[PDB]
Symmetry: C2
Subunit: 261 residues, 2 copies
């Protein structure tokens, strides 16, 4: 399906690493859909060039420019920069349906069956289960919806200062309507939950399809030993970090190196 795609975002080089790993993981699990990534001018040329190889489409978004539709809203609420940039995922009208995934997520299995879902489908957020986690969600690109979201960001802002607060406010019937719009937790497994409720992780964690690396320390912030093939504890959670690093080590770094020549 050329009209459907997975979409991610990177506003700097650190998250670009995440996006490259994410995109590679989707290729690894043979998705039949297109891969697109939103990028900002702050992403270095070498990183953008790597993204052009992994992703089918690289879209540049610069909300800092007066010409951008979200710029005016940005001036009003500057703390929503990342959010407003992410909302541009709805401007990708070349696609009929997409699955947005933050650059700090990792695909562990084919999840093309997510395209059978309707907007707005997302997994429950741990912490406050009646809000969905915005790390992974099925949506339909639309200039109308995009403009509607910008209007809410402008008028109300976000209750949590992030894109998750804004998205939950706009798509507020999620908790009480249509069980099909509740994506199983394994489609966006919070790396945090592998502690808050370990018994449940032990019981159902083996079915994880997507891992969402939350917390201050992102995957790229860890130290990885290529010999033992494991991150340094310097947790029941290393298993996922090691997958991320194996892909980074095996496919992403070799790729970034071919640019030196």
């Amino acid at each position: 399906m050329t009209d459907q795609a997975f979409v991610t975002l990177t506003t700097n080089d650190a998250y670009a690493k995440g996006a490259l790993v994410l995109g590679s993981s989707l290729k690894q699990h043979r998705t039949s859909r297109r891969l697109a990534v939103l990028t900002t001018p702050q992403v270095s040329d070498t990183m953008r060039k790597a993204l052009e190889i992994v992703f089918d489409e690289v879209i540049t978004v610069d909300i800092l420019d007066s010409g951008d539709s979200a710029h005016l809203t940005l001036m009003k609420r500057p703390e929503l920069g990342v959010t407003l940039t992410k909302l541009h995922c709805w401007s990708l009208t070349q696609y009929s349906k997409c699955v947005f995934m933050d650059a700090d997520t990792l695909v562990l299995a084919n999840i093309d069956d997510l395209f059978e879902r309707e907007e707005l489908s997302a997994a429950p957020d741990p912490g406050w289960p009646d809000c969905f986690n915005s790390g992974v969600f099925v949506y339909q690109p639309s200039v109308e919806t995009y403009n509607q979201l910008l209007h809410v960001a402008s008028e109300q802002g976000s209750f949590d200062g992030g894109d998750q607060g804004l998205l939950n406010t706009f798509f507020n019937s999620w908790a009480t309507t249509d069980i099909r719009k509740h994506l199983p937790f394994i489609y966006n497994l919070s790396s945090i939950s592998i502690y808050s409720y370990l018994p449940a992780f032990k019981a159902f964690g083996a079915n994880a399809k997507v891992v969402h690396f939350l917390g201050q320390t992102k995957p790229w912030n860890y130290t990885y030993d290529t010999k033992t093939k494991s991150v340094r504890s310097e947790m029941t959670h290393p298993q996922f970090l090691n997958v991320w690093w194996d892909i980074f080590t095996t496919s992403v770094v070799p790729l970034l190196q071919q640019f030196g020549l």
Copy 2:
């Protein structure tokens, strides 16, 4: 409705305090249903007598006795004692539909509308959102269901060592079926979530109808100043603890005192 009731449980005197506060809170918010409480022989006579005043019905359960239906299962899995005692809520066939509530919960508003729900309806558990939290749930008493649950406890036990693991295993279609069986999080608000996702609590916490005191330190473990009417920090969470203590101070203690004469 004399055929419907709220049901709780207390296996000792500490939780009996919780049950008395819970029952009082339900009376405070004028429930039209009956109030029932499961008790064990370990609850002192004075506490049982207090329970007989607050609750419409006090049922004694002693799984330690060979005559109890759950005894055999208890010998097999002794760590499930509390769970097996709680399962006896399904033996209350004098009721057609009930809302079970753990003794460490607190009602903040009338929640009689829960009786419009079907078994098994429960709110999402923070931590692992695809499991429901067993602190509050709508069920239908039935010897058949009770026996079926005992069979699962005997054969598989509980993945989390508690009643929540067992209930989720038996009522396993909850996460993927019928959005109406997902009780809003405000019907069983985890006291923990008032930190894990404070922004969400600030945004929707004001609508809390039931608070579930989780964590090692229960409400009765805190020190309460009757003058300032607030617990001692010795948190955005005190508001709920103070309600609990106000009811305990105002209605429960005065009640327990009338037994000295």
